[model samples]
Target chain A: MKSVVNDTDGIVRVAESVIPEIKHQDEVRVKIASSGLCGSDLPRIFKNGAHYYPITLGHEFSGYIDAVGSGVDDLHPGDAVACVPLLPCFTCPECLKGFYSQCAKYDFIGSRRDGGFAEYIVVKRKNVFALPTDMPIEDGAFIEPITVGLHAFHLAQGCENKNVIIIGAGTIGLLAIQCAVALGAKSVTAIDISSEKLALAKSFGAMQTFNSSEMSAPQMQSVLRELRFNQLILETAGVPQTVELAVEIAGPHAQLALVGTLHQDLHLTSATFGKILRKELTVIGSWMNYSSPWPGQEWETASRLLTERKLSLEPLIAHRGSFESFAQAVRDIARNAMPGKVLLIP
Target chain B: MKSVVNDTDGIVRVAESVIPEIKHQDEVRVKIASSGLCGSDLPRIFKNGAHYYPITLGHEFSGYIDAVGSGVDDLHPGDAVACVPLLPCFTCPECLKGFYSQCAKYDFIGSRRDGGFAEYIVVKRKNVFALPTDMPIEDGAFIEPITVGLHAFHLAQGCENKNVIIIGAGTIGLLAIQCAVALGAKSVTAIDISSEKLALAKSFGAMQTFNSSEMSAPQMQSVLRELRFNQLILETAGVPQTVELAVEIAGPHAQLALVGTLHQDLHLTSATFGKILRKELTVIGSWMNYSSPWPGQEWETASRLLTERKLSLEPLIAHRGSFESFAQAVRDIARNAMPGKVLLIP
Candidate 1:
């Protein structure tokens, strides 16, 4: 089978690989239909390789069940499904607490094991979630990211009728804009350097948009002055400036949830303390989304929202291709120029 | 009348002053009996002036109602009471939402107006909470600070049966230690440079104590290793080091509440990001204790706890003297050797 493998040498390439098979009674083999490229994939493929060599790299994916082990009675062949990539050791205390993301002993499908980038992959039967039959297979590819958006929304629970600023206009940011609006945010503002991204965010339900790149001091001041402060700041940009901005623009009793992957150090001065202390801001750092006993609440909510059409993935899919162009897709996303999600058909 | 004031010329002393009389129809005159010296008073007097010159430096106070205006029928003369120093304009948005501390139009008695350092102080009728007849007058001086401790505890609500660390053993830290333990924390560890302060904390119900002054690299590593990570860390030291340490020692899903006053900048590096992101720590910044509909929930809770003797101020007061010794008390508490709350009796 063909797969996109990020080898030990920090190189991503389309190569021949053996298809995964179900060897355990509790496992199901999924024939990949559409797999979305994740933001983390770019860095892992171009800048840093996976933990081990020759690893298939994709987690946001959906497929039809090719086969199921004898122990799995609920799933049938050709059933539309999406798999949660987190493989938490069930005995871990965090897993027992239903916080699989914080499980000490855990294996992530894309990073720790072969994931959905391949033609076929076997996952725990419990990790597979059935999508509505009418839902597009391409839309199923977004289940994982949408789940991430919903998890962030869970953290922003108190943001009802409050102003929200999402500091990124990429896939997660767009989804978050939808999530915020759907969750009853009075106004959802999207901030990004790319105008195209901002336009997509506006289209996806952002009430306001700011191109931080073109904002001058006076203009920025006016924006800040007009907005005064925000109740919730979803920092998905993962940049030092946005992190600082999240702290700066937060209002009294504000909640700043950092869902971005910051691979660098963040330097904050007394200003951070001054604003946070005086305003009484709550800074929450959020990592990967997960739930207990298997597929988390995020997964269930994502499924419902998508099924109801309250959330849509149509605007976020920038490009779609088969495994032949997986290498190029990775290369394009690595350029940091693409403003949307890229999906590959296996 | 005699009052201790912080003047613009960087002087603090007791001076003859005119007694404040009940002028407003809803105000009453309070003859202060005992006033707790706040930590902020030292800096305000010796370093910076209050919002204006010649400001009285006392907020934590207990007294008796000397007289009441004609329109105020809530109580009679000689009534035992403690005043909540914050007089918030009830019409403000923040006040309406029950966040008096963040009120846009708020008058703080000690810092923003005539406070309890004087023999006679005037307060709005609503700001006074009557103390039980049997409650000690000195204990009434603690309501404000205890309210602060309770507010911090409110932020640490999920810390029940969790390992808690308090990074200071001063008044606020000691109170937080008690607050955590009283709120059902599994263990409360007090860390400080002073053995005396740590001992004081232990007397107030801390389960463990660490003297950071005597800890070397290996010793510190052992401390960190043994404790592993903390679920709730109350940073009351307000120093740059503890702020950094708070981020370092926080465990997964940990809550770090900053209750101390940090007048300086805090510089964080990538290492801080490493722990904050991976651990998913929630850093909460808490300020002045207050609530709405007159007297915040913290103040009410503090009053009930003190009245029930579930919380104690007996272990915190290190010095008590009349107005004649006010200057000396201030000077002594300003010294590094000082270990507890100082009270001025008027």
Candidate 2:
């Protein structure tokens, strides 16, 4: 089978590779269709290898079942699906404790093993969920990115009736804004350097947007302090500046959930102490989600929202291409950065 | 009465001041019999019209019940007592949440108001607790410090099965060591620069003690790792190094309660990520019992242990003196040049 593999530094190469075999009863084979190139993939391609070289790399993907492996009866060939890329050892204590995302034996499909950049791939049927009835095959690729929003949304539960601050109007940030709003956040404030992205956020129900590129941190904080939303603050920027900005604007007992990768070592201030201890703000580091035991519940929530048509995934797809076009899609994504997921169809 | 107050540049001078009278309903009067100098008071006293000045500067203290306001009971004149300084507004949301320790309106006896520096003092009833029948006045004076340990212990529940590592064998550190031992910790490793304090920690039941000032972090970590016990680390030394060390030695699912106050910042590493996300370590910041609502349940835990003779407070009391001798005690104690609570008897 053909798959995308990393070559030397700053290069990608297509090569012949073995598609995964389904050895267990729960396994099913998917004929690769659509996968998304998240902006985060740029770092792996340019500097660090997203996965070790000569390895398959793509996680946010949607496809169709080509065959069901032994003992699998739920789906047959041509069944459309969206899958979570993380796998955890269900036997680990962390898994049992419902923090399976932190399981010692956890593995990310693309990062730790073979991924969706191939013609055919095998995964546990339980890991696959049906695409919504009206969902387009290519657009369904957004589900992977949607899960990032889903994770933040799921963890952002206690924020009902509270104002939410989404740091950075990047794809994840906007996704969070939409998800938070859909999940019943009373108000949403989106902060970003790009006025266009921030404006887009307002379209997605952001109550306000702050153009932070030109503003000093203290200045931005002063502006945000006036809003005084005491409920929730979610940081999807992963950059230190975004984190500091979030801390500045957070009220007492405001919980900050980290979704963005940190760009630098974080040095929190005494002001952090004032909220952390004084107001008992919960600082939680949410690193993706436990892909198995699947939170079948959230998928139901995702389905219901899709059913009511209260939210739309149409705006989140900025680019689409065939699986054969994965390489060019990557380069195009790297060259023309934007706040949407790029879809690749096979 | 004349009490010495320090000006900035660490200057001190004795000045006469009128004592305050009790007038409020929840108030009580105490002939200031024993007032202990605390390390936190140094920053308070050494000020020239600086922040935290005009401070009486005594918190860890014990005194006789000289008088009681209307509706007061459970105490009488000549009854030896120590005080819990935290006063919580039980009406606030945080108060209702049981995190009264992190209450918005907290009043420490010394810092927020006039404390035990005068010959006579008055206070609200919520701030006082009775001493055990056989506990010495000096021992009773050390309860606040011991409760510092008790609070940390309560936060890091079930310390009995783990190997405890405490950084800094000074007052709070050693006190935590005693509390961990009393709580049935399988073993405790007390680390400090001073061999003298480490020796005292041994007498207090530390199975191992390391001089971190002599070894590099890696070396110290390796030595601790060799113990291979289920590492549960506590930090009471107010240094950034101790905090980093605690993060380093923590094992899977370990509990790390920070009891120290570092003036500098700390940068946690990828290893910290592994200890937490992969290995499941819980890094919690715990202030002393001085935080409000004072967890009546936790207070009862400490009281039961005291009355049952399961814990010892003798090692925590260093000196007993009148209010006049408190100045030198404060100085000596701040330098770690003196031992135990510097009790001031009226």
Candidate 3:
């Protein structure tokens, strides 16, 4: 078996490795078919962000079951499936309350342990979701990213009838636009530095799009002001400026879902921070995708949307190649050679 | 009638003004009794923070009904009452939704119009809450401050059985201590820069107190760590340091009710800001007190607590004098001559 492993900082390579085996009766072995390279993967691979050396890094993946443990009764060999990457400790207080994403003692598949950038991987039966026969393996690999968007909206209690504004037109941002639209949002607006991504966002159900880089700060503020009252704002850019912008543009009683992972310190002007109190905003921090009854409704809804063709993932795929190209594809993504999802066909 | 007025920035004076009469069918004229000066009053007086100068500055007050309009039937002359200072436009969308505090087109009594700094004040029938016959007029003056604390906890859905931490031990922070204890919090801890205020907080209801000014950052972090987990954090200090501290020490899934009105720019380090996401925190900004059916449960609860003697206002009052002393008292407050509430006895 060949697996793409993060051997050290700024180094990723495909190396021959022994296939993983099901060590527990509740475990199942998956022969990888397709795996999507997430933006989160870049930090782990190139920025010394990996939890450990020589770790296989992939959480967004789909495959066929190669084998099932003796105790596994529902799943069988050769069944198509997508992976739910979170491996939350069920005994934590947060998990007890059905908030798996907030579990204090949790192990994530791709970051904390070995994951699916490989020929074969083994996970607990509960972490695997069987995909519909009609669903493409590539779409199955997209379940994780789709659920990322759904989880944010779930925390916002659904954006139905809301005037939603999504910051950043990257993968998660684009998916959020679709989720807001699907959830009956009155209007969906997308903001991004790239015009191409904004165009993609418009195609994916955003009623309007703004290229933030082309506009001055006052220009952006004026446009946001014209939107009048944004009831729901999803921040996916994760930059300090975008996070500040999200807070600045929110209207009275607005709910802001911070879906991006911050990379730098944030300094909000007195006026900008004061708006949080003056407008009485509700700012919710959204983490990795997972909820009650293990893996939660995010996965279920994502699967249904894909199977029903209500969500289009093909347009988001920018690069699709053999596993050997994983390192170069990620580097290309970091260098802005590509601006969408990169997939590895194992 | 002699009233205390902010003629301009840094100048408050006792001036002779005509007694206000009922201008609307639902209006009532209150003969001023006891009026407590608020921290918010300082900015309006000294920093040109008022909506307009030549404004009468007092919102936390109690008095007797001197007269009532022709259409008013619920109250008679000589009835004791406290003022609910918010003047929300009933036609606004927020007011229609029972969120009077968030009304965009709302005027406040103290800042927007003449308020309780005089011998007489006029307000609508709905803006006044009658006090029990036996409840002291001073206690009635304390109702507005009590409601500020109650509103914060109300938005937090009550702090019962939760470990609570309140930052700042000024009047509002002291009232919040009582509110947390009265609401059945497991433990109430107070943090402040003043040792005297911290002592007063303990006397009010805090189970423990920390003089934040006396401790180093690492020491403060160490003590906060020992609290194990703070499920409910109420920030009453409007400084940027306390706001950042509130976010830094919050535990997983913690609910932070930001009750403070920020006075300066806030800068959160990358690591501190990252906790909001890693912990899946819920940060809610609480504004001025007002709710459904005009003035809501906050008023009702405060009046009940004061009448039942469950909350004490005497310990919080540091200065009690004639309206002529207001200018000097506020100047004293700005110089830290007193660390408690100031009352103008008319």
Which candidate gets the maximum DockQ versus the true structure? 3
Per-candidate local distance difference test:
0.78, 0.68, 0.83
Best-performing candidate as measured by lDDT: 3
Worst 10 residues of 2 chain B by lDDT: B270-279
| Tens digits of lDDT, candidate 2, A24-56 | 888899887887776667667766646576566
Better of 2 and 3 by lDDT: 3
CAPRI class of candidate 3: medium
Docking class of 1: medium
DockQ for candidate 3: 0.71
lDDT of 1: 0.78
Ranking of all predicted structures according to DockQ, beginning with the best and ending with the worst: 3, 1, 2
Per-model DockQ against the true two-chain complex = 0.54, 0.25, 0.71
The alpha-carbon deviation from the true structure for residue A272 of candidate 1, after best TM-score superposition, in angstroms, is: 2.6
TM-score of each: 0.89, 0.82, 0.92
Query: Model 3: per-residue lDDT, tens digit, B168-276?
Result: 8879989989888888998898988898888888887887877877775556657766454547989988889988887776766788998888757888988888888
Ranking by lDDT: 3, 1, 2
Model 1 C-alpha lDDT per residue in residues A1-346, reported as the tens digit of each score: 8888777555678888667768999999999999987887765676563577767888999999999999999999999998788877888666666767777898888888878888888899876789999988878888888877677767555457878888988788888888788778888888899988888788878877778888743464466554544567889888788788777666667788888876566767776766777788888878788755357777877888888888877778778888877667677555465557888886
- Where's the lowest-lDDT run of ten residues in candidate 1 chain B? B216-225
TM-score preference between candidates 1 and 2, better one:
1
